[PDB]
Design a protein around this ligand. Structure first.
Ligand SMILES: OC[C@H]1O[C@H](O)[C@H](O)[C@@H](O)[C@@H]1O
Length: 403
């Protein structure tokens, strides 16, 4: 019979690839359908380039892809329209915001699978050790706490200890981190939903200068090459007071044998001042049936299974990844394992999107300009003032004539 082939997630990032292959094999076994899992690189922008090779070729060699929240506008021609396969009731079991994100010119490109939001991880043991009763609410507090804890821990002999780790590598994750910095300083959304390129302002510049101020000071010098896993590994070994990262790192940090099990909490990222908005960049992954699949009916059945209540539940319980079904956020088992899903639900609801809707199919070019200009500030090559001016000019060129 048919072999249903899936490219989604990565064995190079936590347990995602392993768990994904597990779920796909379970569907295979339950339905009597042969399946194959194709692995992907860690970073989303590398995955896009890979999958683009299959799409350009109209390749039938992958039936189902896991696609980023930022991709629907790019990948829509390569997606089978799922709308005819779901009832209105079925489709309403997902968050409307994500279904809308995934719907391009009326085409439902993909089902919501898991959502994502950037959050602050913090070592509760260390805050208590150094006299702090709450995680930081402002970036200045984060810096003050990081400096004091680092001084103490370095003095006690942990030469590997840092204050803060994050994603500073030149790739999509830096765009995510940087949107949070900018937005949390009152600097806007880089490109606003209405099309306005707003990033050339003093608040955005300050946010970038502040981040440069971390590098080699409270954050490792090598943070400028860190993606999600590099940051997680320093944190997870016990060597960072703070980390910015996504939900998936929670379950990994709690696993038996983690040096930091039971020593950490999560909260909203800090912000410049009390009246700035809270920033959490909206991430997440969706399930797309290939327009080039020879087996659309079977592939849709697999995508419905993967997006089902019980598979999303497993993803939440075992991998601490955020459901795209509101009903899971009241599930007793999801909540007992991850109580912070309830505490931070409003953070997740107010998460801020990168400018993929407004940039559409040119989003990957916009984002590359963003991470390259931000990176040049993190390296000390440019000041924030110059970088946001240069970034405005690049984005203007990229989006000229885009409506
Ligand atoms: O590295 C950036 C990526 O991180 C996570 O995978 C998010 O879910 C995704 O939306 C984002 O693009």
């Amino acid at each position: 019979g048919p072999v249903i082939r899936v490219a989604g997630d990565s064995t190079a990032v936590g347990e995602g690839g392993r768990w994904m292959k597990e779920m796909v094999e379970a569907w295979g076994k339950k339905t009597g359908t042969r399946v194959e899992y194709i692995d992907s690189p860690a970073d989303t922008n590398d995955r896009l380039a890979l999958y683009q090779q299959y799409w350009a070729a109209r390749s039938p060699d992958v039936d189902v892809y896991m696609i980023d929240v930022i991709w629907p506008g790019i990948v829509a021609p390569h997606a089978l329209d799922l709308k005819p396969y779901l009832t209105e009731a079925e489709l309403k079991e997902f968050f409307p915001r994500i279904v809308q994100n995934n719907t391009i010119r009326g085409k439902l490109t993909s089902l919501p699978f898991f959502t994502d939001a950037g959050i602050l991880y913090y070592r509760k043991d260390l805050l208590e050790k150094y006299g702090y009763t709450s995680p930081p609410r402002t970036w200045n507090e984060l810096e003050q706490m990081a400096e004091r804890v680092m001084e103490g821990e370095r003095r006690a002999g942990n030469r590997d200890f840092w204050g803060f780790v994050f994603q500073g590598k030149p790739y999509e994750g830096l765009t995510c981190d940087a949107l949070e910095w900018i937005y949390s300083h009152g600097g806007g959304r880089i490109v606003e939903p209405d099309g306005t390129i707003s990033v050339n302002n003093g608040r955005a510049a300050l946010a970038l200068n502040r981040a440069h101020g971390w590098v080699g000071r409270i954050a490792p010098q090598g943070v400028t090459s860190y993606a999600e896993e590099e940051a997680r590994n320093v944190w997870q070994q016990g060597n960072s007071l703070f980390m910015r990262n996504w939900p998936y790192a929670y379950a990994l940090g709690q696993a038996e044998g983690s040096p930091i099990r039971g020593k950490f909490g999560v909260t909203v990222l800090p912000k410049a001042s009390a009246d700035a908005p809270n920033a959490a960049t909206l991430g997440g992954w969706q399930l797309m049936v290939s327009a080039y699949s020879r087996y659309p009916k079977e592939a849709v059945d697999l995508v419905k299974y993967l997006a089902s209540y019980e598979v999303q539940k497993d993803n939440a319980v075992r991998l601490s990844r955020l459901p795209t079904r509101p009903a899971l956020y009241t599930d007793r088992d999801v909540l007992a394992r991850n109580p912070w899903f309830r505490d931070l639900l409003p953070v997740f609801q107010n998460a801020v999107s990168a400018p993929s809707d407004v940039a559409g199919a040119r989003y990957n070019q916009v984002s590359e300009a963003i991470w390259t200009e931000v990176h040049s500030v993190l390296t000390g090559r440019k000041k924030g003032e110059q970088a946001v001016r240069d970034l405005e000019a690049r984005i203007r060129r990229i989006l000229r004539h885009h409506h």
